[PDB]
């Protein structure tokens, strides 16, 4: 039931300017959003898009919301910069991943499935359509950056994903 929604969908300000990466990503960043909170109809999802985005923009001065997409309690899957953009969520690997962040604070809480699934799916489409490698490594943001980013709860969760990797597994500079 999972549907793909467009940046104009949800309303979203026009980015300020569009970076692009080549090649199929060969990273997937997952993060949480903390603030805002869980969103579970679609409209307050596609207001929490946009109060991220604002918040980006306006606020931070960087040329769109951060992340690549968006997923909320809804279901729904919202296009942010959307795929081969150079993405603002995760330093060192804008340019070559897809950051996706499920709205709300998932230290504790689990995100409830249509989430999960939203997530899963996603990627899977991004591999389908060529657009994320399909040797993938699926990381969460605290692994690349000191940062509680993606919650513990939701940490554990990715933990059992398939291509969930950590980058000590390989050892040297
Ligand atoms: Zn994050």
């Given at each position: 039931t999972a549907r793909l929604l467009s940046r104009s969908d949800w309303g979203?300000?026009?980015?300020?300017?569009?970076?692009?990466?080549?090649?199929p990503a060969?990273?997937?960043?997952?993060?949480?959003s903390y603030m805002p909170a869980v969103c579970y109809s679609?409209?307050?999802?596609?207001?929490?898009m946009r109060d991220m985005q604002d918040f980006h923009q306006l606020e931070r001065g960087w040329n769109d919301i951060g992340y690549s997409f968006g997923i909320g309690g809804d279901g729904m899957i919202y296009t942010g910069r959307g795929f081969n953009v150079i993405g603002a969520h995760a330093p060192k690997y804008?340019?070559?991943?897809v950051g996706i962040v499920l709205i709300g604070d998932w230290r504790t809480e689990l995100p409830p499935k249509q989430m999960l699934?939203?997530?899963?799916?996603?990627?899977?489409?991004?591999?389908?359509?060529?657009?994320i490698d399909p040797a993938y490594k699926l990381l969460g943001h605290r692994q690349v950056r000191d940062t509680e980013c993606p919650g513990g709860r939701l940490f554990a969760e990715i933990s059992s994903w398939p291509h969930f990797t950590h980058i000590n597994d390989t050892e040297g500079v």
């Open positions: 979203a300000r026009l980015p300020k300017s569009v970076e692009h990466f080549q090649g060969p990273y997937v960043i997952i993060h949480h679609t409209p307050d999802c596609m207001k929490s804008n340019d070559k991943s699934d939203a997530a899963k799916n996603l990627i899977a489409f991004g591999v389908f359509k060529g657009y």
